[PDB]
From a paper:
The tripartite motif ([name]) proteins form one of the largest subfamilies of RING-type E3 ubiquitin ligases, comprising more than 80 members. [name] family members typically contain a RING domain usually catalyzing ubiquitin transfer; one or two B-box domains mediating protein–protein interactions; and a large coiled-coil domain region, which is involved in self-association or oligomerization with other [name] E3-ligase proteins. About two-thirds of human [name] proteins feature a [name] domain, also known as the [name].2 domain, in their C-terminal region. All characterized family members shared the same overall [name] twisted β-sandwich fold consisting of a 7-stranded and a 6-stranded antiparallel β-sheet.
There are significant variations in the length, conformation, and amino acid composition of the loops connecting the β-strands. For example, we observed a unique 11-residue deletion between β-strands 2 and 3 in the phylogenetically more closely related family members TRIM9 and [name]. Compared with the recently determined structures of TRIM7 [name] with a peptide substrate or a peptidomimetic ligand, the putative substrate-binding site in the structure of the two phylogenetically closely related family members TRIM9 and [name] was much shallower. This was largely, but not only, due to a distinct orientation of the β5/β6 loop. In TRIM9, this methionine, Met608, packs against Tyr619 on β-strand 6. The equivalent interacting residues in [name] exemplifying this loop collapse are Met680 and Tyr691. That this was seen in both the TRIM9 and [name] structures suggests it is an intrinsic property of this loop in these two closely related homologs, rather than being induced by crystal packing. In summary, our structural data provide a platform for future drug discovery efforts but, importantly, also hint at significant challenges in developing potent small-molecule binders targeting the canonical binding site, especially in cases of particularly shallow surfaces and those partly or largely occluded by either loop collapse (TRIM9/67) or dimerization (TRIM36).
Residue numbers in the entry: 609 to 772
The structure:
């Protein structure tokens, strides 16, 4: 179980619903992290897309605590993310794009994030279906759940979820 960390986020992040819900005041992407740090075991969580207006690229994944908070997740070397619009996703890390996958998100979609620190992998799901191949492998160290979004998106966190 974790929530959004109100002390982790860019100041433009807006938390609500006992810190289970996030949006942003900015049209620029801003980061917020979860209250959990993972270093072992297998973790799965979901983000429900409460609101998706226009054509933004919210991003979902995991990060080091020192991730830059005022840019899309995966623009620096401290986050591993899937960014996704209404049409398609990309995987991003270190501002490098891999594995474009057709099929995106919309209001009512769910994004699932599977951080497997036994196998050292990060895998994404949309609406219960794996999105692309395993996104990143040989992932090591300590990760916090991460989100970036702007004012065109609102997401609600669902945690304490059984691994599929």
């Amino acid at each position: 179980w974790f929530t959004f960390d109100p002390n982790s986020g860019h100041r433009d992040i807006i938390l609500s619903n006992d810190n289970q819900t996030a949006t942003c005041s900015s049209y620029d992407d801003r980061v917020v992290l979860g209250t959990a740090a993972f270093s072992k075991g297998v973790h799965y969580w979901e983000l429900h897309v409460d609101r998706y207006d226009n054509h933004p690229d919210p991003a979902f994944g995991v990060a080091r605590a020192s991730v830059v908070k005022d840019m899309m997740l995966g623009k620096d070397d401290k986050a591993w993310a899937m960014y996704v619009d209404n049409n398609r996703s990309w995987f991003m890390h270190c501002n490098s794009h891999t594995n474009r996958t057709e099929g995106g998100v919309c209001k009512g979609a769910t994004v699932g994030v599977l951080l497997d620190l036994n196998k050292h992998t990060l895998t994404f799901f949309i609406n219960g279906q794996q999105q692309g191949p395993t996104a990143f492998s040989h992932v090591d160290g300590v990760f916090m759940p991460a989100l970036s979004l702007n004012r065109n998106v609102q997401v609600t966190l669902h945690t304490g979820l059984e691994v599929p």
